Every structure is written in structure tokens, then in C-alpha cells.
């Protein structure tokens, strides 16, 4: 139900080995750890959560962009990219959180499907 | 070797049934028809060409965005989105041409892989 | 030295009356309030800080995109757009933080100039 | 009434000295030259046309992105960025055509205002 995809707009490629941390806003309004991983050779991170565990709520996806650009010898602007959204608030959905990265810019979109 | 993917940034979904026409710049410098199709339920168009036929050159991918937005009752700015690029000019590659659409904006990127 | 500009990709217009909150990372590694305001009729927010006060550090620009869309007869995907970056690490610069908004996507860029 | 602005997502700067060519679709359905220029140090191109001359029609803005990148020690993906749109179909408007450039991606938006 939750997948993250990261692309590199400088090289025209998947962004490989990018670290991702996912949080859920708790009953008390603080950010509780939820899931993490690194992108694959296809720039994708699967297997973050299960349908059962991915209940309605506010989630934060942090994508560690800065370390990615440094490893490539390219000077970056942002510390990371943070995507904060409400999930499943009309019922269970499958989410792809995509990020397209440049050193001084990024784009993020959600593709939300109903099985 | 050539795939086109189209996303809708208003609805957060694949852009389905979007018409695509692909041209190749000919020896004479004019735009010759090459391939066409419509996006699927996943917003993807596969099977445009074969490795054999997809030789080096300048290609144009025209995505008929205007008809897409009209069918949805949303007022659009652009007539279409046109992506013009040189392909295979360091050797054969697999290309994904992605377009993320809004009524008054679009983003396009290429994901270029080497099998 | 710090300006925020916000555009609406649905309407093709400035995003007016968008609330913005700016934080700076403190010596103790928490987010200290730094500046705030709302975008004007041109989608711009000037007058956030002064050259003297805008020293080197990690800054967070929170753009309250959800309320913008909730006001217009949308229900968007994101809670807000956050832009986190290190400022003035090579000396004083002027920063424009731009954001282009759609209901299920946004893009953000920085324009960094040396006066 | 018509302005073009071009930004560089790699450097976080205006894209300076970018060539732009503007065409209008003629009664006979071919592309007639209309206006041209190069972006300034602010990445902007003003003075393309006048209110009197900029009547309703289909316009094409060609932004010569390849030469921009070829000058800088890149070899980009796209030959150019083309933006094709109907102007003034509900009456006279002022248009800013913005483009944010990366080597393998670009985004383009319109800001359309009613003076
Ligand atoms: C379905 N639904 C409606 N109509 N309004 C909601 O807030 C809602 C939430 C929801 C329901 C289930 Br069952 C589920 O597994 C997940 Br996750 C979310
Ligand atoms: C995500 N994205 C953004 N933010 N700008 C884009 O052009 C874009 C494209 C995209 C490309 C592929 Br390929 C893909 O599988 C998915 Br999902 C999205
Ligand atoms: C490989 N190569 C190099 N080094 N410079 C080129 O222009 C080039 C082009 C090319 C070669 C093959 Br065989 C092919 O199937 C495709 Br289509 C493109
Ligand atoms: C100039 N400089 C260099 N070379 N490395 C730095 O970290 C740095 C920081 C800086 C200096 C001044 Br004076 C200033 O007003 C601001 Br604001 C930032
Ligand atoms: C105003 N108007 C309406 N209502 N429908 C149109 O097609 C239209 C076009 C138009 C009118 C003027 Br007078 C003008 O200077 C420019 Br230029 C465009
Ligand atoms: C144009 N644009 C795109 N396509 N993606 C962006 O983030 C973006 C930002 C933009 C930034 C400034 Br500064 C500006 O004056 C204008 Br007019 C637009």
C-alpha cells in the first residue's frame, strides 16, 4: 500500500540507495517512527508497511536527498525532501509517493489508486 | 525501448486514454510519423517500437493534454505537451518519457536505462 | 534576503493569501521560530528578515498549502509543503523560495543570487 | 503582455542568455514567426510584443535549452522546450511563460493575469 519512487533529473535515471524514513502523527500530535528503507536499483522502495498496519492518519515521508547529491559530486540546496499527507481518509488506498530531484529543486506527486 | 507515462497532478492518478503521437526527424529535416497510441489504465503506453526500428535520431513525443482536461471539465492552458530529444546517441537505451500534468503546467522527465 | 513565491498550477495564477512560517535550527538542534507572513496578490512574501538577522544556518520554510486548497473547493493531498535548506554557508546570499502547487503535487525551487 | 522566464534547477539561478523564438498559428494552419529574444541576467525576456499586436490565437514558445546546457559542460536530453497554448480566447491577458530546467527534465507553467 505504500511505495516511494525517486528519480534523478540531472542524470535521467532512478535515484539509487536513497534513504527514506516514514513517520505517523500519533494520538498525541508528535511524529512517531513508522517505516524506513533505501531505494533499489529501480529508484523504488517497496515493503514499507502492510495493509493492516497502514491505517488512516497523517504521514511524513523524509527522503535524504542531500546525501544522494554529495555522493555524486554535485552541490545540493536542500537538506532533505519531506512529504506530509493524510492517508486513507476516504478508505484504504495504494499510494506511490514520487520525487523528482535536482540539486536546487524537487517535485513530488502522489499516485493514489483504489484496488 | 520506448515507453510513455502520463500522470494527473489534480486527481493524483494515472492519466488514462491520453493520445500520443511520436515522430522522427528524417534525413531531410522534416518530422516523419513514427508511432502512436493511447495511455492505459496505468497511464502507460508500451509497444510503440522495437529495438530494431528505434535507431539513433531526434524524436518528438506529442501528448494530447488538452483533450484529456476537457473530458474532465477542467479548463486547460496548453494545446499539447511536446517532448523533443535525441535518442541512442551513445548507444541503444531504454527510455521512459514521463509527463506530470496540471491544467496550467506540466513537468516532463526522461528515465534512461542501459540494459 | 529571503522571499517566498507561490504559484497555482490549476488556475495559472499567483497563490494569494498563503500562510508561510519560517524556522531556524537552534544550537540545541530544535526548530526555533524565525519569521512568518502571507503571500500577496502577486503570490509573493517579502520582508521576512533583514541581512543582519539572516545569518548562516539551517532554515525551514513551511507553506500552508492545505488551507489554500481547502478554501477553493478542493481537498488536497499534502498537509503543507516544507522546504529545508542550509543558507549562507558560503557567505551571504539572497534566496527566493518558489513553490508551484497542484492538489496532488508540488514543485519547489530556489533561486540563489549574490548581491 | 508576454514574458518568458527561465530558471536553472542545477545551479539554482536564472538561466541567462537563453534564446527564445515565438510563433503564431496562421489562418492557413502553419507556424508563422512572431517574436524572439534572449533571456537577461534575471532569466527574463520582456518586450516580445505589444498589446495591439498580441491578438487571440495559438502561440508557440520555443526555448533553446540544448545550447544553454551545451555551453555549461552538459549534454542534455531535450533539443528544446516548446510551450504551445491558446492566448486571449476570453479576452486580453498578460502571460508569463516560466520554465525550470534540468538536464533530463523541465517544467513549465503559465501565470495568466487580467489587467
Ligand atoms: C473507508 N473510510 C471511509 N469511508 N471514511 C474513512 O475515513 C475510511 C477509512 C478507512 C477504512 C478502512 Br476499513 C481502512 O482499512 C482504512 Br486504512 C481506512
Ligand atoms: C513523479 N514525478 C514528478 N514529481 N515529476 C515527474 O515528471 C514525475 C514523474 C514520474 C515518473 C515516473 Br517514470 C513514475 O513512475 C512516476 Br510514479 C512519476
Ligand atoms: C553505440 N553507439 C555509440 N557508441 N555511438 C553511437 O552513436 C551509437 C549508436 C547506436 C548503436 C547501436 Br548498435 C544501436 O543499436 C543504436 Br539504436 C544506437
Ligand atoms: C562568508 N562565509 C564564508 N566564506 N563561509 C561562510 O560560512 C560564510 C558565512 C557568512 C558570512 C557573513 Br559576513 C555573513 O553575513 C553571512 Br549571513 C554568512
Ligand atoms: C474579449 N474576448 C472575448 N470575450 N472572447 C474573445 O475571444 C475575446 C478576445 C479578445 C478581445 C480583445 Br478586444 C482583445 O484585444 C484580445 Br487580444 C482578445
Ligand atoms: C516556473 N516554475 C516552474 N515551472 N516550477 C517552479 O517551481 C517554477 C517556479 C517559478 C519561480 C519563479 Br522565482 C517565478 O518567478 C516563476 Br513566474 C515561477
Show the 3-state SS of D50-76: CCCCCCCEEEEEEECHHHHHHCCCCCC
State in Å, rounded, how far the first CA of chain C is from the last one.
10
CA distance D36 to chain C (A): 23
Alpha carbons C68 and C74: distance in angstroms, whole number: 9
**Binding site for L-thyroxine, residues of D?**
5, 44, 107
Cell, residue D26: 496562421
- Closest-CA residue of chain C to B8: C104
- The CATH number that applies at residue A71 is 2.60.40.180
Q: Pick the atom of ligand 4 nearest to C54's CA.
A: 17
Interchain contact C10–A (C-beta under 8 A): no
Q: How many domains does chain D have?
A: 1
Measure the CA–CA gap between A45 and B68, rounded to whole angstroms: 30
Count residue pairs from A and B with Cβ separation < 8 A: 29
Contact B85 D107 (CB under 8 A): no
**Total Cβ atoms within 10 A of residue A36:** 13
Beta bridge partners of B31: B25
Chain C residue numbers with beta carbons less than 8 Å from the beta carbon of B76 are none
Which residues share a beta bridge with D73? none
Q: Is B51 annotated as a binding residue?
A: no
C-D Cβ pairs (cutoff 8 Å, strict): 29
Deposited resolution, Å: 1.6
Tell me the ligand closest to A56's alpha carbon.
Answer: 1
Distances in Å between the alpha carbon of B19 and those of B38, B75, B106, D59?
4, 18, 16, 21
Number of CB atoms found within 10 A of residue C115's CB: 7
Instruction: Tell which residue, A57, A88, A67, has the closest CA to residue A16.
Output: A67
* Grid cell in block for residue A94: 495504494
Contacts (Cβ under 8 Å, ≥6 apart) of C53: none
Rounded to whole angstroms, the Cα distance separating B102 from A103 reads 23
Q: Count of residues for chain B?
A: 115
Rounded distance from Cα D9 to ligand 3 centre (Å): 30
Residues shown for chain D: 115
Are D84 and B86 an interchain contact pair (Cβ–Cβ within 8 Å)? no
Q: Ligand 5, residues D1, D2, D24, D56: which to mutate, most atoms within 8 A of Cβ?
A: D56
The finding on whether C32 has its CB within 6 A of some atom of ligand 4 is no
| Top mutation candidate among C24, C55, C91, C95 for ligand 4, by most atoms within 8 Å of CB | C91
Distance set, CA B88 to CA B35, B54, D59 (Å): 17, 8, 31
List the domain range (segments joined by +) for residue D70: 1-115
| Residue A53 touches chain C, beta carbons under 8 Å | no
Give the CA dihedral B42, B25, B114, A21, nearest 10 degrees: -50
Burial class (CB in 10 A: 0-12, 13-18, 19+), B30: exposed
Amino acid at each position: 500500500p505504500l511505495m516511494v519512487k525517486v528519480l534523478d533529473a540531472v542524470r535521467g535515471s532512478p535515484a539509487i540507495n536513497v534513504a527514506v524514513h516514514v513517520f505517523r502523527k500519533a494520538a498525541d500530535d508528535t511524529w512517531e517512527p513508522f517505516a524506513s528503507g533505501k531505494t533499489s536499483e529501480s529508484g523504488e522502495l517497496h515493503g514499507l508497511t502492510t495493509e493492516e498496519e497502514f491505517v488512516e492518519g497523517i504521514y511524513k515521508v523524509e527522503i535524504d536527498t542531500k546525501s544522494y547529491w554529495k555522493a555524486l559530486g554535485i552541490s545540493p540546496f536542500h537538506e532533505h525532501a519531506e512529504v506530509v499527507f493524510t492517508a486513507n481518509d476516504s478508505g484504504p488506498r495504494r499510494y506511490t509517493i514520487a520525487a523528482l530531484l535536482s540539486p536546487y529543486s524537487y517535485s513530488t506527486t502522489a499516485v493514489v489508486t483504489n484496488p
